[PDB]
Amino acid sequence: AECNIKVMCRFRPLNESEVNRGDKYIAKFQGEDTVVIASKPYAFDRVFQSSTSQEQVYNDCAKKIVKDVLEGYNGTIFAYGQTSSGKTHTMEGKLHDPEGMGIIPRIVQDIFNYIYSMDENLEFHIKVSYFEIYLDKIRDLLDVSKTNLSVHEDKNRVPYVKGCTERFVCSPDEVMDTIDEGKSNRHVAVTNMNEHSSRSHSIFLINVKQENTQTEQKLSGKLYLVDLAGSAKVSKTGAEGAVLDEAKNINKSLSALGNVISALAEGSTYVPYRDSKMTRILQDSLGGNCRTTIVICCSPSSYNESETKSTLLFGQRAKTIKNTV
Amino acid sequence: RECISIHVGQAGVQIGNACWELYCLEHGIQPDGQMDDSFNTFFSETGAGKHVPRAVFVDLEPTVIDEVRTGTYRQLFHPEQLITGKEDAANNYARGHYTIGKEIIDLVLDRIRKLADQCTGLQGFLVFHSFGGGTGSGFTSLLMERLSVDYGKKSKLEFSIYPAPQVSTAVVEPYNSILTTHTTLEHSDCAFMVDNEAIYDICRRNLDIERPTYTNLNRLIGQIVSSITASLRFDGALNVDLTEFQTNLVPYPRIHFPLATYAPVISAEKAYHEQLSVAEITNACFEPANQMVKCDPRHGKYMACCLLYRGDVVPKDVNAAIATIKTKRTIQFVDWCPTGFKVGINYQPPTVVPGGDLAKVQRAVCMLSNTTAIAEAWARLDHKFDLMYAKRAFVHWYVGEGMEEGEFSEAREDMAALEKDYEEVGV
Amino acid sequence: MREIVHIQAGQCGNQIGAKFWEVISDEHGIDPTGSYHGDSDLQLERINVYYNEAAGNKYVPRAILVDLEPGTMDSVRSGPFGQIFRPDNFVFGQSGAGNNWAKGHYTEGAELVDSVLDVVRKESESCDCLQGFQLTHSLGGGTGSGMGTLLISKIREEYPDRIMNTFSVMPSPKVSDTVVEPYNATLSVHQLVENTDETYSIDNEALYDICFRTLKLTTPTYGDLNHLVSATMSGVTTCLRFPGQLNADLRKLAVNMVPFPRLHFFMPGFAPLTSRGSQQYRALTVPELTQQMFDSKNMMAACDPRHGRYLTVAAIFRGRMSMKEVDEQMLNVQNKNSSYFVEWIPNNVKTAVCDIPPRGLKMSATFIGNSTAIQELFKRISEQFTAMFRRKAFLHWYTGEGMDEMEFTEAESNMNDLVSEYQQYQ
Amino acid sequence: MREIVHIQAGQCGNQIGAKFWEVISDEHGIDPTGSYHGDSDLQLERINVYYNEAAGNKYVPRAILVDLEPGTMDSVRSGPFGQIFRPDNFVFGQSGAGNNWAKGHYTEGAELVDSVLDVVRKESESCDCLQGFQLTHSLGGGTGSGMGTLLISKIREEYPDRIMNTFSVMPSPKVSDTVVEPYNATLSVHQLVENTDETYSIDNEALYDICFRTLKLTTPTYGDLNHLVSATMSGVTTCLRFPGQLNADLRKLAVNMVPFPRLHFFMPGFAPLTSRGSQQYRALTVPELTQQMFDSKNMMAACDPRHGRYLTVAAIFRGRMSMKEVDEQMLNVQNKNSSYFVEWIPNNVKTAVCDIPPRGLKMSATFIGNSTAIQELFKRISEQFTAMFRRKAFLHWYTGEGMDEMEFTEAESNMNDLVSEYQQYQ
Ligand SMILES: Nc1nc2c(ncn2[C@@H]2O[C@H](COP(=O)(O)CP(=O)(O)OP(=O)(O)O)[C@@H](O)[C@H]2O)c(=O)[nH]1
Ligand SMILES: Nc1nc2c(ncn2[C@@H]2O[C@H](COP(=O)(O)CP(=O)(O)OP(=O)(O)O)[C@@H](O)[C@H]2O)c(=O)[nH]1
Ligand SMILES: Nc1nc2c(ncn2[C@@H]2O[C@H](COP(=O)(O)OP(=O)(O)OP(=O)(O)O)[C@@H](O)[C@H]2O)c(=O)[nH]1
Ligand SMILES: Nc1ncnc2c1ncn2[C@@H]1O[C@H](COP(=O)(O)OP(=O)(O)OP(=O)(O)O)[C@@H](O)[C@H]1O
């Protein structure tokens, strides 16, 4: 009926550039729910500490959404934070290794391993697509010809992506091939703060159309596994040339995501989902029937303290929002 | 004893239209560029019977840089100094700092280095800009970062133009003023401020100019900057160089925001019906009706007051004048600086602009004051910014340039940290 | 140097565009033959921003005149100023749009827009640095509404950074010259709000109202209305065409007039608008122009501004004038009339003044305004849309060009969302 | 600088207003074209108090000419001075009032007064500091009586501090030009006493009496009567229009002529009023003017002052004259004639003298007087009211415009209360 949007926090270890600069470990935790930064507790639903691993985050963050989205509802998981925080590491990581991989392939293995446990008569039509937002253009990742798709509303006025290559998959190994094909197609540039700087908002949708042959009750569960880009200060990164133009549309979308989160948290009237196309496809996640859970990957260094605390204000402002499930 | 100037934005170049009009007039330099040691501070000799300013005009919009190239001052200005852009910053602090800023600083900062090596006695800098548009706000903070790291030890005289308290030419400039002050606090050695409705109000009441345009404003603004540098250009009983302003008015390295004022602001017909001495012009410069910013001094306290006089002024009567200021209780200094007074005298009086509005006087005062009265302007300027920032008004343009939520918060807390110092020193 | 490529689409867009070149050519002192004969050299300073230099001291405008009816080009070509345009820019089909949005957007203009896009590339690459695209079209009919938004999509696609300026002439129910007005209007604004950054909502009902009340004309032809709309186009670009005490680029207008990216629907104005009888009985002082600018009846849109509030307004002045009297009038119009201005913005006014007035007039002004009251134009069009859409009348003529019913639904949702957001900040 | 916005309502108010601009324009040396050609520079000193500066050294009066019959404006426009007025001020309906108070106050003028109020705001906001509203209307008929009091209510509502000056031309039974005189008069004064601060009760019977006895005219047209009423309007405002040894503002007249707020119904006068034959046989000395001023027959109202007593009188003089002879005549007219002056006020006279006489005349004077004898004008109107109201004749034409019988009762009570209070201080 109604549920709370679940805000969680995660911190990485200090990277090479941070420890070589001599950044202080300012992260202090009072339990696994609150973090004390600058003598201020910032409460979240689950603060994953700096010593957490990949499996430890997935078991508590996105382990429940597998059962929720397959029950009949829709899910949405997406990471927020500045660049070099570990959004690409936490979500994608390195998909070949079982331990080094992120939340996305663990979601893939858990759904298929769960479905094999079910009875054979429970039929499952699973179609998957993969696309990104690059220069404010919906660049498909599983296909190269389609430069920009168009946003369309469903039968009951809910926005989706028309023309996306919804590849019908059968086995989980085929899904891993789709991610590797899409991971290579993702526009990723080099920066001093983040060498693997994802310059686009990659969305990896799992549309599990599920129906039992005996009862004939048809259901569908959309699971939006999104990896956003980092809110990069140009003074620290030094974005110049082509990557400077990439920084425009990135922070435009992240600020627009901050606008709708600030608009919906205060209980505003309009909630401008139409501000950016990134906010459009998230409209079903924010103000729909989805049990949306959000993690934020934050850097523990004092050098990025300004952008880090703003990520916590984005998080705690998102904590007061409730979804109409 | 030289000091090279730069002019950013529409306000900066419009100051340079009138400010250099009175510099070249004071040294007998015609617009052609020719007619001993007085003009060397702001004019270099070119071969034989010719002068060139140590001036640089930069404006990303080409609207008014070419106006000087086709105006009356064509021969005086070297045409390579008149640097121009290709497209406009358009009232965006970010656009003049990152996109359009970073394509022309490579020309002008290395060109400013050329005038440095051409000079030998470079005392410091004096920039001209405004916090209104993106040019005066964004490009200056970008250039000040690269000029500070290049030299550092040299001084910088920031003659900014605030947005007025209720009068205003635009809507987005609170974002410009709060962002450019976040960077200007740690870079500028001296930050002189000017207001729009105050200078409109001064010439209306005292000078009796009911319908002024911007060219009438810039005449006396250049007179203010000409007054502080007249001690370098001419001899006097007690000369003061540029280095005195840093040592006398900056008690702490963060509070470096003086307030400028000028007197006697008297028309041509009122000069005959009013006697001018040092006493009445001294008291005239401290009252709120003649301050260049809309802030009353009685609400705060004067931390320091540098009194720079011109023309025939003896040194014994000024000591009587400042005594009356100290015993008058409507204005009161801070206990931590009881001898908050510096005197400067120049024998050469001010010069009248032909066809201007001001009148020739045998003596004049250009008083600079570091005080806590500017904290009221910071608060109301910071207060009005909070309403637009709370609703994310006009944020989609700046973050579309590349910025984010972060530096707005750094600009907010930096302003509170600045005001934290003013309430501290106001004790 | 901040060049401007001009687009004209539809019969109305070609008519206001044709008269628009008539006005500014007289401001620059340009002959109908194209030779320059201006008195002041400042006219020839920024002549490149709308013209291109040619041999024999001749000039040609960068006017891409688009249509689907060849009769419109013959009227422009045979007009007083048809000879100045390049003959190559006249790209036009054979069959008219027939007042169908889907024809110009999918079948009729879709084959022709590819030829037009090559001419846009020709005029753009010849430029030094173009600032924006000044487009003129009406949302009534199929040509300006359907093919125009298609052309805006391609230019916005190739130029995602330039200033997409449009002058959308949108009528009201008080003057319903076409039964297919809501489908042409509702589908056109579905594309404009997502792409463009300026939308000057001009209404024919308001334009006729100017001619009777303040202009006092007995027989206002369309050419009289085109003279008024041309005055607004020359006013907004006056800063970047001549020297001025405050030069505001179109980007510098867009940064102040657009507090949120979707809220970019404006309402223009112009003054002095005096009759022949009231010429000598009116003072040319600045406060007289300001009261005519902010006059609720002197707006060029059907929505009265008193029904809502201004998010942000601009006043581009022309001619010699004191800045202090301008600042007081910009100050006074928000003190006493604070109910008509939102107070969560501290200062809702933008000022600008050029040192060259219009030809023949001593002083002038031009108004821009993004009001919350403008939503009623979208509300009444939605009422007309839902009135005809509830029984699906005249929709089958759109299905022939492949357009589906969901595209009408997506346009109506984006239309109704635009009404709600102006109601938020009211 | 103490500006004055002028209002004209009704046919009589437009006629006396039209001739009023004719007189003072000649005092200031203003052409019918509006260009200034005066000899003395003092005329151009306070020209702003009734005019506005325009280009080409042209001037325009701040005259808001209101009516419900368009024929009245055509006569004023075609007159000797119609070309000086602004064409925008002529706000007028299509159908006349038909001599009904309720039409102009509820149906006919109620829709038109909203348009007129915007013009009052236009002329007021253009002023520096307005002092009061000089209104001219007759209580006979529906336009001046009904719409005029409605317009006074709105201006008094928005301006509760300015001086509401009115010149109510009220007829007597001796000249009964309309059967609906008492209903128009009784209902109009119900609003005037509550709102206004000056009410110059002028009567047509007294005005004709001036032409025969002291002026000695064979065929007194209405224009001859308008010349006399214009002389009183120019006399009361002469202090605040030219330099003078004693400058009394209209507020400085209202403070002395209004001992209680309801007792503000006056009785004007003017001198020298000499015939063509008696020009050379009359001395221009000051005592000759004073005896003509306080002459009981030379009052412009039907009520003789000998039947009551003056609460307070004023004498605004014009031209060069000794103050001592003025003070003696102001002294002597209360010593011997003390029966005609209440003695619970010690000094019932107000004096004032300007240093500029009328054009063509060497000296002049203007009289104001608040007498207890003025109540008989209200008494006889009440007799006519109760004569027709006892059987309710012609009241059904007022019920059609929503006016109820109790409003006639409330007007009659406030009318009769006004008669009792002048009887108190008699
Ligand atoms: N102010 C003006 N409005 C005009 C003028 N011509 C038309 N219009 C108005 O614009 C409305 C529609 O604009 P258009 O005439 O251009 C119809 P369009 O050419 O775009 O389609 P088709 O002619 O069917 O190919 C139209 O109904 C008028 O209300 C004009 O010359 N001036
Ligand atoms: N001294 C003058 N008195 C006039 C003049 N014209 C009319 N009157 C007198 O005033 C009386 C009524 O005044 P009006 O003529 O203005 C009637 P009004 O126009 O207000 O109503 P409607 O004409 O019915 O719309 C009228 O009966 C005359 O006795 C005039 O020109 N001069
Ligand atoms: N006192 C004074 N102020 C001025 C003058 N000219 C401009 N200003 C102020 O400067 C402010 C903006 O300055 P700029 O940054 O130079 O504006 P700009 O160069 O036009 O910026 P763009 O819109 O991007 O072109 C305005 O709000 C004015 O109030 C001047 O001549 N004198
Ligand atoms: N928790 C972690 N433990 C160890 N290494 C990490 C962790 N998080 C990030 N890293 C390192 O950071 C590198 C790149 O970081 P990543 O690309 O995830 O930053 P990001 O926040 O995704 O940047 P973007 O702004 O592009 O999203 C990885 O190759 C990885 O080695």
Q: Do C255 and B66 touch (CB under 8 A)?
A: no
**Looking at beta carbons, which residues of chain A come within 8 Å of C261?**
275
Experimental method: cryo-EM
Residue type, B143: L
Element (H, E) at C102: helix C101-102
**Residues in chain C after which the backbone breaks (C–N beyond 2.5 Å):** none
Ligand 4 within 6 A of A85 CB? Answer: yes
Looking at chain C, how many residues does it have? 426
Residues of B engaging A, defined by a Cβ cutoff of 8 Å: 98-99, 102, 392, 395-396, 399-407, 409-410
| A/C touch flag: 3 or more CB pairs below 8 Å | yes
Neighboring chain B residues of C47 at a CB cutoff of 8 Å: none
Residues B327, B297: Cα–Cα separation, whole Å: 16
Q: What strand order describes the sheet that includes A34-36?
A: A28-30, A34-36, A41-43
Nearest Cα of chain D lies from the Cα of C306 at a distance, in angstroms, of 14
Q: For strands C269-271 and C91-92, give the pairing.
A: unpaired
Encoding tokens for residue A293?
Answer: 């859970």
The reply to whether C413 touches chain A by the CB within 8 Å rule is yes
**Cβ count within 10 A of residue C283:** 16
**Residues from chain C contacting residue B177 (CB–CB below 8 Å):** none
Smallest CA–CA distance, residue A60 to chain C, in Å, is: 38
The pairing of beta strand A151-153 with beta strand A159-161: antiparallel
C-alpha–C-alpha distance, residues D169 and D185, integer Å = 10
Q: Interface of chain A against chain B, CB under 8 Å? A: 231-234, 239-240, 244, 247-248, 251-252, 254-256, 258-259, 262, 275, 306-307, 309-310, 313-314
Q: How far is CA A144 from CA A139, A187, B78, B101, D136, in A?
A: 8, 12, 54, 35, 84
The conformational region for residue C137 under phi > 0 = left, psi -120 to 50 = alpha, else beta, is: beta
Which amino acid is residue B422, in one-letter code?
A: Y
Return the ligand number nearest the Cα of B215.
3
Q: Say which of A247, A256, A306 has its CB closest to residue B409.
A: A306
Contact C303, C417 (CB under 8 A): no
A292 ligand 4 Cβ < 6 A: no
CB atoms within 10 A of CB B9: 29
Q: Judge whether C158 is closer than 8 Å to chain A, CB to CB.
A: no
**B369 phi and psi, to 5 degrees?**
-140, 125
Q: C218 CB contacts (<8 Å, ≥6 apart)?
A: none
Q: Find, in chain B, the residue whose alpha carbon is nearest to that of C197.
A: B397
User: Which has the closest alpha carbon to B332: B295, B372, B364, B366?
Assistant: B372
CA distance C291 to chain D (A): 9
Which residue type, as a one-letter code, is found at position B127?
A: V
- Cβ contact, residue pair C281, D60, below 8 Å: yes
Smallest CA–CA distance from C246 into chain B, residue: B10
In a 3-state reduction of DSSP, which class is residue D53?
strand
- Closest-lying ligand 2 atom to the alpha carbon of residue D140: 12
C269 SS3 class: strand
Residues ≥6 apart with Cβ < 8 Å to A282? A76, A78, A224, A226, A257, A260, A273
Q: Are B63 and B367 in contact (CB under 8 A)?
A: no
Distance of CA A208 to the CA centre of its chain: 18
Question: How many angstroms separate the CA atoms of B162 and B195, rounded?
Answer: 5
Decide the pairing of beta strands A167-168 and A122-134: antiparallel
Residue among B63, B169, B396 minimizing CB distance to C260:
B396
> Which residues in chain B have Cβ-Cβ distances shorter than 8 Å to C246?
10, 169
**Distance in Å, alpha carbon of A293 to nearest chain C alpha carbon:** 27
Tokens standing for C24?
């500014």
Q: Which residues contact B39 (CB under 8 A, 6 or more apart)?
A: B27, B29, B51, B233
Does D142 carry a binding-site annotation? Answer: yes
End-to-end, the C-alpha distance of chain A in Å comes to 5
H/E element, B363: strand B363-371
Q: Residue B366: enclosing H or E segment and its boundaries?
A: strand B363-371
Task: Answer yes or no: do A272 and C262 touch at CB < 8 A.
Answer: yes
Query: Ramachandran region of residue A81, left (φ > 0), alpha (ψ -120 to 50) or beta?
Result: left
Tracing tokens 């506005």 back to the chain, one arrives at D52
Cis bond before residue D272 (omega within 30° of 0)? yes
User: Are the beta carbons of B175 and B138 closer than 8 angstroms?
Assistant: no
Burial class (CB in 10 A: 0-12, 13-18, 19+), B273: exposed
Q: Which atom of ligand 4 is nearest to the CA of A196?
A: 17
Rg (CA), chain D: 21
> Tokens 């030809």 appear where?
C359
Residue B393: name the closest of B162, B183, B170 by CA: B170
Closest C-alpha among D267, D285, D283 to residue D367: D267
CA of residue C139 to ligand 1 center, whole Å: 8
Residues 6 or more apart in contact with residue A59 via CB below 8 angstroms: none
* Ligand 3 midpoint to CA D44 (Å): 40
Question: With a 6 A CB cut-off, is A233 part of the ligand 4 pocket?
Answer: no
DSSP 3-state assignment of A159? strand
Ligand 1 pocket list (CB less than 6 A): C 10-13, 15-16, 68-69, 96-99, 138, 140-144, 169, 171, 177-178, 204, 207, 222, 225-226, 229
Query: Is residue B244 annotated as a catalytic residue, yes or no?
Result: yes
3-state secondary structure of B280: helix
The CA distance from A113 to A95, in Å, is 17
Q: How far, in Å, CA of C88 to CA of C68, rounded?
A: 16
Residue B149 burial (C-beta neighbours within 10 Å; 0-12, 13-18, 19+) = exposed
Contact call for A310 and B409, based on CB within 8 A: yes
Collapse the DSSP code of B31 into the 3-class scheme (helix H, G, I; strand E, B; otherwise coil) and give the result: coil
- Does the distance separating the beta carbons of B63 and C240 come in below 8 Å? yes
Exposure string of D201-222, with b = 16+ CB inside 10 Å and e = fewer, is: bbbbebbbbbbeebbeeeebee
Residue numbers in the known binding site of C for GTP are 11, 69, 138, 142-144, 204, 226
Q: Residue B247 is inside which H or E element, if any?
A: helix B243-249
User: What is the position in ligand 3's atom list of the atom closest to the CA of B12?
Assistant: 16
Determine the 3-state secondary structure of A225 from DSSP.
Answer: strand
DSSP C31-93: -TTSBB--SSTTTTTSGGGTEEEEGGGEEEE-EEEEES-HHHHHHHHTSTTGGGS-GGG-EE-
Rg (CA), chain A: 19
The alpha-helical segments, DSSP class H, found in D36-166 are 70-77, 101-102, 108-125, 148-158
How distant is the Cα of C47 from the closest Cα of chain A, in angstroms? 31
Chains that touch D (3 or more CB pairs under 8 A): C
Q: Which of B145, B244, B280, B407 is catalytic?
A: B244
Atom of ligand 4 nearest to the CA of A228: 27
Nearest residue of C to residue B88, measured between CA atoms = C249
The residues near A107 (Cβ < 8 Å, ≥ 6 apart) are A58, A62, A65, A66, A77, A206, A223, A225
Most distant CA pair in chain A, distance: 64
Please list every residue in chain A whose beta carbon sits closer than 8 Å to the beta carbon of residue B407.
Answer: 233, 306
Q: 3-class DSSP state for residue B392?
A: coil
C405 touches chain A (CB under 8 A): no
Specify the amino acid at residue A48: F
What is the C-alpha separation between C142 and C104, in angstroms, rounded?
6
Q: Which residue's CA is the nearest one to ligand 3's atom 14? A: B133
Torsion, Cα C336 C338 C340 C345, to 10 degrees, reads 150
Residue of D nearest to C274 (CA): D88
Eight-state DSSP code of residue D255: H
Q: Give the span between the Cα atoms of C199 and C164, in whole angstroms.
A: 9
Question: Whats the size of chain B, residue-wise?
Answer: 427
Atom of ligand 2 nearest to the CA of D14: 16
The chains found to touch A (3+ Cβ pairs under 8 angstroms) are: B, C
Measured between CA atoms, the residue of chain C closest to residue A271 is C421
Question: Helices marked H in D307-359 — which ranges?
Answer: 323-335
**A–D contact (≥3 CB pairs within 8 Å)?**
no
C-beta of A304 in contact with ligand 4 (< 6 A): no
Q: Which-ligand-closest: CA of D140? A: 2
